[PDB]
């Protein structure tokens, strides 16, 4: 343990991690444990895809999805998605390939147009934008809001959901707040669902802004790494009850069950909402890929079917996660200089190493070749203020890969905490 | 010759008309000649794509399609579509299913970022922006500057392009005028095509604004109604050569050659531009749809395929636009109260009736059944300062539909005529 370790201790330990370091080298190793994409494996599940529809090309409404007209997507995988939602099939719409694109755009329409209810379009408020961002959290979510000139304000993420505590007392004083970015459930990264009292929470309390929003990005709706699905908590029911009924904006894709990139994205949220972002979504494109959302309806059959295929994925995901788990236990758990997530789904682990060592941990990691994601990369602006978080992607990788890439890892985090302990 | 007659044989032929439009009303008709969009006949050439790419999921670099990464899009369909509008690849991108989609977000970064080399954007502009807009025009063009708040400014449109006399007066005084929305080949609805010497000085002029743009929207580059496509003029090479690389974006789109909403979108600019773009595309999207671009590129082969497919479309739309020409001519041409284009290609004919009448005949035709575009449509603002102009699709409706339709229009066109001469 390196609290406990005497000063020769921790001069021969880091010198027996100097040798580890020097062999890791030698192993010219090219690894790559940065990005959160599925395996060619998991894609293998779903060809299928690759010749579907056929030549039927008609919806079970009889629409010829091969022509111009439609906005809101096709009702029959709307219905399979809204039964795994919990939202009904009018409050949710179907999209293309990227569901950022569509939470991109709404954050666009806000700055240019103002929400439905919006006093007046975001970009004409003189102090300035504010969204809260639960930290650890997705860096795509920033680069959005970073890109637009928002101001992010980060707020410790706890075991069941952020600190509502914090972010009521933030948004009752302050009128520029006016999003928070979630993916609430299996969050990227810290694989932390926010339960039903978190989000009974956010869609209750009162908010300096009259348009305040939540970011509702489920991502991981249905990527569970047991056999069990999670309940999905009914946002929008509860925030109607509030009598916020526009404040959550819910967001879902198809990208890690069909194809990454290939799949099709869906939208939801109360009528007003659907009505208002239709609106403008209008004057972008006359409409979806219908054909694409035509071979999801095909290939899916219906939610059971999801289900099936989200098993399927499981199983090639779930001993990922296990080895990740523990192979930091075998080098690390003794060292007591980290901690990570043991996450129930979702598609990351999230380590912390020791204080003050996580930008050189990565750069550690490089020279061996073990691409490591970015330090900071989970924080608004990449700015974590203890430097010591990590995000690990297992999902790509072949298992021996997996092994070896975070074996090199942990070598690296243990080299660079005594490092910074001598000093 | 209705305008040189004779009082009781005009009130005489108003009650011919009269007549001719009670027969009609008889018919109980419901037809339709608003929808640019390809016939079922049509759709029907590409259905092979409803069963592509098959098993092999890779281009021909050897990318897996299914996964995520790449914003340019595959480089083989960019190579076709390079050949066909003289773009070099590296200048040309592919997206998805929507180039207005792509022509939006262009306009929204302007107003949100600026452009490449713009002293500030577009929406730190304290005298506002405006655009040119040659009419008759595209009206969802004018939907994207009308909602952004762009103030449309309507231009004459001659027998080779727009009047650039006009143009090059107005820009050369008012740094207001960022942009020009065009369509250079068969021009939606007017037919006309830029002329070699138009796209020259348009390239050329100096403007006002440093960061002046030609919104090149050629959405009918090979889309002939003979046997021969046009050619196209390299107008991102005359405009580097002009000192101006950056003035013009190109867009394309396959919604007319394979599936309207489910084909493969294009941009084309200078590396500037096409690197501007992505830089804030990237904001919004991992990426496009590469299965798609995969399905597309096996379907055509090369840039021949594309020529053949689209004198397949020929072969259905020639027919007819002929016809729509010959019950025009038959029906009109001896009042002399109406004029229309016949064109080489594209989507649509323009027809104008006797000024003060298209409102008239829009609702005359409606109350017998024949819905027809509104007047004022491909006008921004929906302003036919002439109230003469009306457009017609003739893609989509069956052979009898469409005599049907034409006749009946006619016929309405030709009663409104009487009323107003009479008035
Ligand atoms: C919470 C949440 N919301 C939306 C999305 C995007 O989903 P859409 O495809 O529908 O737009 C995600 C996806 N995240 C992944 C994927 C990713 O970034 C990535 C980027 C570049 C190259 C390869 C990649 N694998 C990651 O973080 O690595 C996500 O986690
Ligand atoms: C001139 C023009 N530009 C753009 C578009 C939009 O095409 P897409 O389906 O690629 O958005 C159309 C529709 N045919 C059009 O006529
Ligand atoms: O939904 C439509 O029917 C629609 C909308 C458009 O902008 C079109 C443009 C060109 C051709 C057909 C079009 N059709």
């Known amino acids: ?33 940065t990005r959160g994409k599925p395996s060619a494996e998991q894609l293998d599940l779903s060809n299928q895809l690759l010749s579907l529809p056929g030549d039927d090309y008609r919806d079970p409404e009889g629409t010829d999805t091969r022509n111009y007209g439609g906005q809101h997507g096709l009702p029959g995988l709307r219905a399979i998605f809204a039964e795994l939602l919990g939202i009904a099939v009018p409050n949710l719409i179907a999209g293309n390939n ?7 755009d709404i954050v666009a329409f806000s700055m240019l ?23 650890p959290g997705y860096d795509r979510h920033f680069a959005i809001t970073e890109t637009m000139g928002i101001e992010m304000i980060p707020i410790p993420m706890l075991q069941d959901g952020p600190d509502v505590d914090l972010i009521e007392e933030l948004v009752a004083v302050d009128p520029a707040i006016k999003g928070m970015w979630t993916v609430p ?67 879902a894709s198809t990208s890690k069950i069909t194809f990454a990139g290939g799949g099709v994205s869906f939208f939801g949220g109360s009528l007003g909402n659907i009505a208002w972002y239709l609106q403008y979504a ?33 199983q090639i995901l779930a001993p990922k996660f296990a080895l990740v788990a523990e192979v930091l236990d075998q ?48 924080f608004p602006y990449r700015k974590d203020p203890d430097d010591k978080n990590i995000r690990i992607a297992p999902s790509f990788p072949s298992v021996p890969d997996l092994r070896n890439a975070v074996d090199g890892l942990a070598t690296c985090a243990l080299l660079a905490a005594t490092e910074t302990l001598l000093n």
């Not at 921790?10 to 027996?16: S, V, Y």
């Not at 802004?209 to 970011?215: E, G, I, N, T, Y």
């Not at 209008?282 to 309806?297: A, E, M």
């Open 98 to 104: 990227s569901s950022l694109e569509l939470m991109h």
């Open 1 to 33: 343990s390196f609290d406990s370790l005497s000063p020769q201790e921790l001069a021969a330990l880091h010198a027996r991690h100097q040798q580890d370091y020097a062999a890791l080298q030698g192993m010219k190793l090219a690894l790559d444990l």
């Open 282 to 314: 209008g004057k972008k494109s006359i409409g979806p890929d219908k054909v694409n959302q035509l071979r999801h309806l095909r290939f899916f059959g219906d939610a059971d079917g999801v289900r099936l295929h989200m098993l399927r994925h499981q």
């Open 185 to 251: 459930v299996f969050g990227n990264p810290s694989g932390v669902t926010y339960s039903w009292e978190t989000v009974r929470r956010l869609v209750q309390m009162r908010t300096a802004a009259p348009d305040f929003r939540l970011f509702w990005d489920n991502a991981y709706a249905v990527h569970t790494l047991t056999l069990d699905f999670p309940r999905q908590v009914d946002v929008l029911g509860l925030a109607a009850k509030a009598g916020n009924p526009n404040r959550p904006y819910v967001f």
């Open 113 to 135: 147009y103002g929400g439905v209810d919006s006093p007046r379009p975001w970009i004409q408020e003189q102090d300035g934008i504010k969204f809260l961002c639960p930290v």
């Open 331 to 378: 080098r690390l758990s003794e060292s007591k200089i980290a901690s990570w997530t043991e996450p129930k789904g979702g598609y990351f682990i999230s380590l912390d190493v020791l204080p003050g060592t996580a930008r050189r941990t990565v750069a550690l990691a490089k020279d061996v070749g073990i691409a490591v994601t970015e330090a900071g990369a989970s």
